[model samples]
Target: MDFPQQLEACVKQANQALSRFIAPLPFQNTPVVETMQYGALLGGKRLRPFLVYATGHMFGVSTNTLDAPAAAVECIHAYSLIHDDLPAMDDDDLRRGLPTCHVKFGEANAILAGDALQTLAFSILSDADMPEVSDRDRISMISELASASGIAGMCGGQALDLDAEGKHVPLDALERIHRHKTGALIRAAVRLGALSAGDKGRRALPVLDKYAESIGLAFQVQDDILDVVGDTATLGKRQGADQQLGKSTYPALLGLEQARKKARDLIDDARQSLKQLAEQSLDTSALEALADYIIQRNK
Candidate 1:
């Protein structure tokens, strides 16, 4: 299958597995669960989960065994969105072209939903039903996710972003923000998948880090590009909203064309990093496809 078809297949499998896992939960009447599901099921690129599955495929791990980690990464992503859109945060009214979770489910329910999803991520990772990954590997995966989601990572980036809003942030500071807020988990997704497959030797680390850094930043660069060039209908959210909000972005700092150029540069670097791995007999088609898709994605 082609890249688009592969992406769709990965997303479909993830959504199906998540839905099945959530369906039997005993919280049928709980608004928190409702809101969590609502925001999660909202259309997304499913990039984090895709990373988990794709990296797993490269390492010869089974898709069925990758489901829990994929779901966990997605839950983390969804929870971040819920918290990011709160009244005290981004305070937006729409997400993926639908009402924000707080707007649709009320602030209290939204908070609870985000909390539940955070815990659910760990639950899925630790569940007895999940495939039997080694305890040591599971521990590493848990640490990877925790560090990425905590104050040192996503939350730290968000704090800096809020502080930097309406001001001229230094380029290095801006890169720091994107690295933690957006890129950390993406990197973790790829690393987690590799770790799950027992590929933690020193030989694999640098190549994986190169891929992680390039694609992670590339993801943010594409978002910045889309903010300027895309429409709400295609983006599933407001366009040029960052400018309206007086936020710093790639385009704001580098210009639109320059930002696009940087994105391509990063993609080139990402693809190049995989070449050595391929020479070592690693099938890196998934990594190559992901690099291209990150730059080409419209939403």
Candidate 2:
């Protein structure tokens, strides 16, 4: 199958697993539960989960074996978005071209839903019954994701972002903020996929890390570029919100053409990281295509 087709399949699988996991919640009738479901089930690219499945597949891990971690990472991502859109944060009213969790569910309920989603992510990693994930690997996955989502990763980046707002920070500092805020979870996604392969995955970690880091930064660079050139409808969120907020962005710091060039360069580096895998006779086409998609996507 082609990369887009494979990506669609991955999204379908993750959605199915997520639905199954959320369906049996005892508190399904409660408002918070409803909000949680709404936020979690809201449609997007499901890119992180696809990374998990794709990278794991490269190392011979089955889709079934990768499902729990995939769902878990997505839960973290969903929760982050929910919290990020709150009044205290970005104060966004729209997400995925629909009302954001807070706008639809009210602020208090949105907060609770985000909290619930965050805990649910770790719960899935801890309690999933997949035999392919050994206890050792499960713990590793949990630790990897925890660090990525917490103060050392996404949260730290958010803090940096808030501090940098309305300030004239240099490009290096801006890169640091995004590296922790956006790139951390992305790197974790790739790491989780490789980790799912057990020892074989460990052997591949160095190359995978390089690929993950390159694409993570490239993804954010493209996002900054899009915010400049895209419309709200295409972006599924407010276009130029970053600029309106006086936030530092790739385009603001480097100019639109430079930012675009940087994205292309990062994607090139990411693709280069796959060369060793190819030399080893591993399939790296999907990952290479994904890197390209990172720059090409309008949203």
Candidate 3:
């Protein structure tokens, strides 16, 4: 299948896995469980899961083996979004063109929902029994995700972002914020995908790291550009929200043209890293296309 087709398949597969994973929750009727389902099952691109599947596929990992980590990363991502949209955070009322979790469910429930989803991620990873991934590899995946979602990763970057609000920060500072906030999880997603292949994945880690880092930054750059150029309907969230929040953004620091140029450069760098993988007879086309899609996506 081609890139779009493969992406759609991955989305479908990820959604199914998430549904099955969440369906049997012991407390289904509870408010928090309801809210958890609402936040996680809400339709989004599911890009992180796609990264897990795509990268795992490169190393011949079975989809069954990749399912746990794919769902785990997405759970972490969804939980982050739930918290990020709270009034204390981005104060967003809309997400994926629907009401934000706190708006749909009460604030307290949303908070608990986020908390539940965060733990749910580790739960899924720790509980899964996949012979394709050794016990050691499974533990490594958990560690990678924990580090990515914890203070050293998304949470840390978010704290920095909150602190920088309404203040002018340099480009490097902005990069640092997003590298932790956005890039960390993305890096982990790629690594988790590679790790699903066991020792074979370990051998290819360095090139994958380079590819992940480049695309991770590129994804954020495009997001900043989209905030300026995209409409709310297309973006699935508030347009100009960053500017309204007085947050530092790529377009704010660099001109629109420059930000676009930067995103393209990052994409080029990502593809260059993929080329090294391709030289080893790995199929890098999907990853390369995903890098382009990261910059090209409207949302």
Candidate whose TM-score is highest: 3
Query: Which residue pairs clash in candidate 3?
Result: none
lDDT of 2 at 195: 87
Could you give candidate 3's per-residue lDDT for residues 1-299 as a string of tens digits?
A: 47778778988899888877888788987889989888987778888998998899999888987888999999999999999999999999998889999998889999999998999899898997566888899999999999999999999999988988988799999999888889999999999999999998999999999999989988888988998899999888999999999988889889799999999999999999999999999998788889999998888
Model 2 C-alpha lDDT per residue in residues 94-148, reported as the tens digit of each score: 8889999999989999999999889998988898766777788889999999999
Per-model TM-score on C-alpha atoms: 0.95, 0.97, 0.98
**Model 3: ten consecutive residues of lowest lDDT:** 1-10
Instruction: List where candidate 3 sits over 4 angstroms from the true fold.
Output: none
Better of 1 and 2 by TM-score: 2
State the C-alpha lDDT per candidate.
0.83, 0.89, 0.90
Count of backbone collisions in candidate 2: 0
Better by TM-score, candidate 3 or 1:
3
Q: Model 2 off-target regions past 4 Å?
A: none
Task: Give the candidate number with the greatest lDDT.
Answer: 3
Q: Is candidate 1 or candidate 3 better by lDDT?
A: 3
Lowest-sum lDDT 10-residue window in model 2: 127-136
Cα lDDT tens digits, model 1, 1-299, are: 49888888888988976776677778876788889889887677788889888887777778887887888888889999999889788887888989899999999999988888888888787772536478777877888888988888888888988887888687788888888888888988887778778744225767887898889988987887898899988888778878877787888988998889989999999999999889988888988998899999898
